[PDB]
Amino acid sequence: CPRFLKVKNWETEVVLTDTLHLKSTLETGCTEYICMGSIMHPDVATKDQLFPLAKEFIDQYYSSIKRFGSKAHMERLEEVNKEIDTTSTYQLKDTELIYGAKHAWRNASRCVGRIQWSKLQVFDARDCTTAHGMFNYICNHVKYATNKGNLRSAITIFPQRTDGKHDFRVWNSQLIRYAGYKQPDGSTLGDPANVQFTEICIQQGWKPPRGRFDVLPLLLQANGNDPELFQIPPELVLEVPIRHPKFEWFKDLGLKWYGLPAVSNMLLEIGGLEFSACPFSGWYMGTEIGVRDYCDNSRYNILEEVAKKMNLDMRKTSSLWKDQALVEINIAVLYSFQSDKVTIVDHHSATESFIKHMENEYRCRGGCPADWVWIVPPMSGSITPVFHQEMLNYRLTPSFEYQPDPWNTHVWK
Amino acid sequence: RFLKVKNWETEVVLTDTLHLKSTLETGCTEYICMGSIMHPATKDQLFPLAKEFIDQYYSSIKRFGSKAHMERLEEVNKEIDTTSTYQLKDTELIYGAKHAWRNASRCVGRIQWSKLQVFDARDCTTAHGMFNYICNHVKYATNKGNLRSAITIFPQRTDGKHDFRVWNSQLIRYAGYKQPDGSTLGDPANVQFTEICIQQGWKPPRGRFDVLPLLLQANGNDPELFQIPPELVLEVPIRHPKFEWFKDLGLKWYGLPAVSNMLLEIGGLEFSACPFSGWYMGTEIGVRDYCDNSRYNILEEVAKKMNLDMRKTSSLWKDQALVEINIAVLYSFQSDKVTIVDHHSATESFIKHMENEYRCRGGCPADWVWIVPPMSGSITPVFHQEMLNYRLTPSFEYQPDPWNTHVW
Ligand code: HEM
Ligand code: HEM
Ligand SMILES: N#Cc1cccc(CNCCc2ccnc(-n3ccnc3)n2)c1
Ligand SMILES: N#Cc1cccc(CNCCc2ccnc(-n3ccnc3)n2)c1
Ligand SMILES: C[C@H](O)[C@H](O)[C@H]1CNc2nc(N)[nH]c(=O)c2N1
Ligand SMILES: C[C@H](O)[C@H](O)[C@H]1CNc2nc(N)[nH]c(=O)c2N1
Ligand SMILES: [Zn+2]
């Protein structure tokens, strides 16, 4: 593998040099002869597998704090080693855990919000033992992160996996999402993406209101046990009704969204330890709601109804009626969040900050992995600077990983 | 191994077997993906390349291992042996050029791949010859507005000292001028080329849309200037179906998109001069040509005339202005009966083409980064389509700008 890889920005002519890729730990899916960069997805670890993984991370941690080679460093290496030998695992110090989560975010190729990576509140919930305990921690996370509209990024880390038969898991894919109900007639009420999960919740005992925007309950699994339902207190679920600065009729659509974007199905890997339940949250880029949640055909799919209210010619596609509605919807989303003083960032500002962040990373770290396919916003791509930016993709560790949906693996008791 | 690709909207799963056929690299490795990087002979090298191509040619016409296939292999071997190169049959040239289009990972218009007018210009010897051939191409392809896809193929490379080259990156483009006050008149992407034209004798009109002359190099010789006769150059005045003030922007574009700077590789032969042309997807003009900061950069002007609040980025004024520009471009071309496809229609056709390719060919190489339109990405179906990228031959490759190689 080559020592220096250059990427270029095609609108500013800036060239950056990447050395960090040499520290790549995992496979990307690509080979010499095929590229899988647009493919969405291209039992525990033995003692022997864990030893070098742990050392790798510990070395890296003591390297970050400018104590590489120190007594404290060597002592820590030895402590971790004995712990692995005697217990087949080890426990992270609170300092290491914090470093590891911040760096898993820093290494997330697909997150455009990474300029903020070092400002992350880490709630250590490794003492949790029950689903009620998980609910408590989760509620505290939500309230802290929401902060009455002034969102602050955060992660709550439940205990690491042990034997695989005692995982903690948040079954929800996000802490806050709306239900989706399939009708006997084929139509979907609510969010079609969440139909399967809503069916599971209803089966577990949830009494559904059956509306368009029903906040799903939390489904919480502690210590490998069956999961349990909890309704998040409504006063902790900040929501924004969507209106438009020009079109008075826009509020008549009755749209709203939740303020807090919180991913809860990913797995946090630090030094070979797997934290299978690690809900994290930041704040929204407008396009996530205005383009994807609202306009994807398999989601809320409102383009037709908005365009109809805009009295647009909808016969030919070459009128770009879809395109026109899309912009107005995204204008509305940004306008509504800013009006109710809930943090949100537009795709222009976010991508511009990411370019600045990426350049700084190259300067100070010798690189910054990024996934162009995810980093480029799903509307008006080329009018943002990331589009013109060459990016290298590669997986560093600590990292956030995907994991199977828990209903597919859970052994019911 | 067989690879699945999934559409996340429709949930359709195609199975790729075609990728197993490729030998050329893509630039990625197992640990690093370079999917967004713009750019990641001898007798001995030449025959296996020749044999490969001839084999897939006789296979595509169900005459594999036939007498004709055998004699042809013999013919090509003897010819490489005694001349260090070899010449393609007419049939092979056509098959080869259509398949270079078909294999073009980055081209969204490939549903049309087998409708390609191939112009064999291999008898060419001079730049005057080149200009004649190109004018015929332009006139045929333009077809009064009912565009027809074409490629013109000039003599293959020999020793590298005798390349045929179209110095222009496209047959039809607009000049670009560095103003004394630091700004750029016309197309900034062509400032250098324009200067090379001016240095060479071209008297520039110094306007915002001056069709550049052709600069043609034949047989490794100094390039020569030629003006395409204006009556062969179809141009569209851009206007808007609601905004009457839009024509007052004075914007115009040319109807014929013709890439002239690439290299067509067939059976290990290199055709350094092979201008090809299709028709426009609207975004190429409306999004990239008109709205890139490094290009015509009109967003500010347009949003001005739309009286938009331009103080904050979160007003999405850029996005608004963008949609209108692209509406205007489509409306204009359509009003002039000049062929053009919008990004919804085109991407739809591409999904259909992918499905076709998977059925009959076991796959379709594709560059998601290039296939997804540079506006309204996820409201087009290609955004939700997993694409596998790999390099098949025959192929269109990039090559150096000739003013970095040529000695005078
Ligand atoms: C602070 C404001 C943040 C912004 C503006 C932001 C922005 C984004 C966006 C737009 C996506 C694309 C999601 C999609 O299209 O499905 C994303 C993905 C992601 N972000 Fe963030 N993010 C933020 C905070 C965070 C934090 C705090 C973390 C972790 C500690 C994080 C880690 C990730 C990861 C791991 C993904 C990939 C998710 C997946 O693959 O499904 N982000 N981010
Ligand atoms: C028939 C109508 C066609 C349409 C609508 C179409 C569409 C497109 C578009 C939108 C691009 C992206 C250009 C860019 O963003 O720089 C592209 C690239 C390309 N097309 Fe086409 N195309 C057509 C015909 C053709 C033909 C006839 C050929 C060859 C015989 C061809 C070969 C290519 C190649 C090699 C590229 C890559 C260009 C590069 O790498 O710079 N296309 N096509
Ligand atoms: N696997 C998978 C998979 C495929 C498509 C979309 C997905 C969602 N990924 C995260 C989406 C999402 C939602 C809310 N918030 C955030 N978020 C919050 C902070 N950073 C991102 N991200 C997962
Ligand atoms: N090198 C290089 C390089 C990098 C990015 C874009 C580029 C231009 N690509 C072609 C643009 C263009 C122009 C006119 N016509 C067409 N066109 C027509 C049919 N297919 C493409 N394409 C070159
Ligand atoms: C097929 C393709 O990879 C898929 O649709 C991707 C494209 N890029 C994306 N980019 C972001 N940010 N989020 C997504 O969900 C996707 N989906
Ligand atoms: C850096 C990045 O690869 C570059 O900006 C690409 C992105 N995708 C593109 N897609 C198309 N169709 N045409 C282009 O010129 C580009 N440019
Ligand atoms: Zn790749």
Q: What oligomeric arrangement do these chains adopt?
A: homodimer
The N- and C-terminal alpha carbons of chain A lie at a distance of 49 Å
Output the CATH homologous superfamily of the largest domain in chain A.
Answer: Nitric Oxide Synthase, Chain A, domain 1
What's the architecture of the largest domain in chain A, going by CATH?
Alpha-Beta Complex
Q: What is the alpha-carbon Rg of chain A in Å?
A: 23 Å
- Which small molecules are bound? protoporphyrin IX containing FE, the ligand N#Cc1cccc(CNCCc2ccnc(-n3ccnc3)n2)c1, 5,6,7,8-tetrahydrobiopterin, zinc ion
Helix content of chain A: 25-40%
User: Strand sequence of the main sheet of chain A, in spatial order?
Assistant: 3-4-15-12
| Helix and strand composition category of chain A | alpha+beta
Largest protein-protein interface: A-B, 65 and 66 residues
**What would you call the shape of chain A?**
globular
The CATH class of the largest domain in chain A is identified as Alpha Beta
**Extended strand count of chain A:** 18
How is the biggest beta sheet of chain A arranged?
A: 4 strands, mixed
PDB class: oxidoreductase
Keywords: oxidoreductase
Assembly: dimeric
Entry title: Structure of human nNOS R354A G357D mutant heme domain in complex with 3-(((2-((2-(1H-IMIDAZOL-1-YL)PYRIMIDIN-4-YL)ETHYL)AMINO)METHYL) BENZONITRILE
